[PDB]
């Protein structure tokens, strides 16, 4: 629901969400090939 939302918020007032007390599955993000600008630092996508 965060990623495939109905509509995102405006860029100047962006959609803000807090994630805690959760078993966050990053594997669903990792396996998806629709992403074309997977640019991050500090952590590898496979070791995330």
């Amino acid at each position, epitope marked *: 629901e965060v990623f495939n939302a109905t509509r995102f918020a405006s860029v100047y007032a962006w959609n803000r969400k807090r994630i805690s007390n959760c078993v966050a599955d990053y594997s669903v993000l*990792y396996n998806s*090939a629709s*992403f*074309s*600008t*997977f*640019k*991050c*630092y*500090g*952590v*590898s*996508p*496979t*070791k995330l």
Partner: antibody, heavy 119, light 109 residues
């Protein structure tokens, strides 16, 4: 802009050498990362390490040189890479290149400096 | 650190033909690829970034494609000055994946 190297040349086997890359026309901001890459005389390129610019101290090392290289930023325009226990297999040409914050390719490569590990 | 295999080691194409190079990744990189052309006695020069984007001053003959772990570099209308060595590199600088180069491929006119 321009990138230049100094501190290479002949190094005795088993010793340690220091190579410095100097920038001209810009600063080592957090939007650009330094990197070190080597080339064997008749072989291809081998990556060494990178260090994020700006106030960030984040550094990344290669698997092969994890224990034999040390990369850290000394100033916004000068920087040093130190390698220990030099062997004849380390005789290569070192290139100092910059990386944009977009995770785009290497642009504005350095001319390169040749290091020789022999007596 | 991701390891990059580039094939073929050596390729030879006539004038005006098309030469293709394949670059494979051990793990998924999500683009973040850079293609380089190096002439003897010269530092490598950038050709393609993000595996699909061409930089300024780069001819349209060079074309990048592929995604996931398989990538392709295509050079059309080969010229006498195109004789060089081509390399592929992941651009994961602070991602713990490293930026390890693959085996260079030389082109013969």
């Amino acid at each position: 802009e321009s990138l230049e190297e100094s501190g290479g040349g002949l190094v005795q086997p088993g010793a340690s050498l220091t190579l410095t890359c100097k920038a001209s026309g810009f600063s080592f901001s957090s939007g650009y990362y330094m990197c070190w890459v080597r080339q064997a005389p008749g072989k291809g390129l081998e990556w060494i390490a990178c260090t994020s610019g700006g106030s960030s101290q984040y550094t990344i090392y290669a698997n092969w040189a994890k224990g034999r290289s040390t990369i850290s930023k000394t100033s916004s325009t000068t920087v040093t890479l130190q390698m220990t226990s030099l062997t004849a297999a380390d005789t290569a040409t070192y290139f100092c290149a910059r990386g944009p914050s977009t995770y785009y390719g290497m642009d504005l490569w350095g001319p390169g400096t040749l290091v020789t590990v022999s007596s | 650190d991701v390891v990059m295999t580039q094939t073929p080691a050596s390729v030879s194409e006539p004038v005006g033909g098309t030469v293709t190079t394949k670059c494979q990744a051990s793990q998924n990189i999500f683009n973040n690829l850079a293609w380089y052309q190096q002439k003897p006695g010269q530092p490598p020069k950038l050709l393609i970034s993000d595996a699909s984007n061409l930089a300024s001053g780069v001819s349209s003959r060079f074309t990048g494609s592929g995604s996931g772990t398989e990538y392709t570099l295509t050079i059309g209308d080969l010229e006498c000055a195109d004789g060089a060595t081509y390399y592929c590199q992941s651009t994961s600088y602070g991602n713990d994946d490293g930026a390890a180069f693959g085996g260079g491929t030389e082109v013969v006119v």
